[PDB]
RNA sequence: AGAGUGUAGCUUAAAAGCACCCAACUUACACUUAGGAGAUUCAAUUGACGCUCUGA
């Protein structure tokens, strides 16, 4: 009740420095298997390090054999944190994979 | 107080060759293969023979060009399966220690400029390096008059390391030779921020 | 650590046999690729 | 069809891979924490010894937007 | 241009406040939405009205809200709630007064 | 040389709970189901084996 000390006990809706922008990591790989595995690993690293990941979609395949494409969206980095993130990405690239740090549009 | 301004860079050459698979990983390779055939969904002999002979005629480049040298520490291709770090001997007026390539910086030059200068100051080459951020990777202070050394980080994209037989003592260390070459605690802890992997 | 996720597989259900064919694009860099009908060696002219 | 012995071997394979990649992730996280804390203590020392350089230490290089770097291979050029 | 809006008040709300003796079947509170949630010995009608399932004293309390796992909207709200957060709702209980019955000597066989 | 000292990553937990990982469902994450390893440094509250800091 409004006048009682327990007023607002049940309210819940309120419960629901240089930084990068939107970062797109593009993974075009000869192998659907390797692309998917790299996407899983990078997503696991992101959610372990508390990185806001928005989308993990894929581009349509292009024929000219085929190369499978994946995308990882990232937002929110720190000075040291970005450095560690991309150096780990560089050091943990399994085999013949194409990274990217491009942005939206 | 009088302070000796000094920076330095722990250059990183990434492994051009991926690490070989362990026997454990090969057993998992066999398991994944057999499950793949189990879970798959549906003159060939002449084609198979032609393709296997096409494979046999061409010899694959050796993944390890290291077993043959055993002494080419100065060579950029000392190791391939693991990352490499530059390490050049230096001789001071009062000290003689195998020290990571250092350089002197001034308040008029920022740390990124100091690192860019050091990229070629001691190598006198056309190496191409890339920086990730102004954030350093290691700090070590040793006094005799204060002093400090900031080990920054950068990665080699490509390198035209001309005149490899330089008068210096540039050695590439992956993980193990770090302790052998750098005894004092202020220099043997570089592995903490060097990617051991 | 360039092998932690190299030992991974397709997680779908409809597909054919895939094999580790070595591929070279233009300069002599052989790479395993999951390719049908084992060639064991590929080169783009 | 399959057999009891190979099923047991597969189970032990899963066990040993669990242990192996557990150690892998543990060492990866150890390196993460070690070099992260090294970087933060380096930034703290930079702030202490240079009040005008930490301001530009946090700035980010604008050349990383078209980042490019290829992965490992087997037969180098 | 503005038509309607002539509906009268529903006369809804609490019919039995705390400390009121309530007999079985009595309506405790009528509500349009779930203002007061049913507590012990309090049943809900089709129209969300709370009625006493036992004869006793009405008590209003604040209790943690744990919706049924099949209540998809509430489960989604919980899934979006930050860790450490606990929802609370006002519950109406009927503390039974009389016992279920007594054992009486009926025949001295 | 001196100080803080001390349960697997965290615990004013006393051999536990959170953590954590792969397998399947997911493009992917998440959820869920199946599994996985884990510690009270050593001797009698005390001393000495390992880590951090203060110096050379
Ligand atoms: Mg009205």
Helix content of chain A: 25-40%
What compounds are bound to the protein? magnesium ion
Q: Major sheet of chain A: size, sense and barrel closure? A: 3 strands, antiparallel
**What oligomeric state is this?**
part of a larger assembly
- Compute the number of helices of chain C: 0
* Side-by-side strand order of the widest sheet of chain C: 2-1-3
H/E element sequence of chain C = EEE
Strand content of chain A: 15-25%
Protein structure class of chain A? alpha+beta
Q: What Rg of chain A do the Cα atoms give?
A: 20 Å
Largest sheet of chain C: 3 strands, mixed
Number of domains of chain C: 1
Could you estimate the helical fraction of the residues of chain C in percent? under 10%
| Count of separate structural domains of chain A | 1
Number of strands of chain C: 3
Largest interface by Cβ-Cβ < 8 Å = B-D, 39 and 32 residues
In CATH, the architecture of chain C is: Other non-globular
Based on DSSP secondary structure assignment, what is the total number of beta strands of chain A? 3
Distance between the termini of chain C: 32 Å
Family (chain E): Belongs to the bacterial ribosomal protein bL27 family.
Organism (chain E): Homo sapiens
GO biological process, one term (chain E): translation
Protein name (chain E): Large ribosomal subunit protein bL27m
Detailed description of the structure:
Chain E: Its main location: mitochondrion. Chain E: It is found in: Mitochondrion. Chain E: Keywords: Mitochondrion, Ribonucleoprotein, Ribosomal protein, Transit peptide. Chain E: This is Large ribosomal subunit protein bL27m. Chain E: One of its GO terms (cellular component) is mitochondrial large ribosomal subunit. Chain B: It is found in: Mitochondrion. This is part of a larger assembly, with chains A (about 100 residues), B (about 200 residues), C (about 45 residues), D (about 80 residues) and E (about 110 residues). With about 200 residues, chain B is α+β, with helices and mostly antiparallel strands. Chain B has a domain at about 70-195: Nucleoside Triphosphate Pyrophosphohydrolase (Alpha-Beta Complex). Chain B contains 5 helices and 10 strands; from the N terminus they run E-E-H-H-E-E-E-H-E-E-E-E-E-H-H. In chain B, strands 2, 5, 6, 7 and 9 form a 5-stranded mixed beta sheet that branches. In chain B, strands 4-3-10 form a 3-stranded antiparallel beta sheet. Chain C has one domain: Ribosomal Protein L25, Chain P. Chain C has no helices and 3 strands. Chain C is flat. The termini of chain C are far apart. Chain D is an all-alpha fold and about 80 residues long. Chain D contains 2 helices and no strands. Chain D has helices spanning about 5-50, 55. The relative contact order of chain D is 0.05. Chain E is mainly β. Chain E has one domain (about 5-110): OB fold (Dihydrolipoamide Acetyltransferase, E2P), CATH 2.40.50. In chain E, the strands form 2 sheets. In chain E, strands 1-3-6-5 form a 4-stranded antiparallel beta sheet, with no helix packed on it. A 4-stranded mixed beta sheet of chain E has the order 2-7-8-4, with no helix packed on it. In chain E, about 15% of the residues are buried. Chains in contact: A-B, A-C, A-D, A-E, B-C, B-D, C-D. The interface of C and D includes residues 1 and 28 of C. Magnesium ion (MG) binds next to loops of chain E. Chain A binds one RNA strand of 56 nucleotides through helix 1 and strand 3.
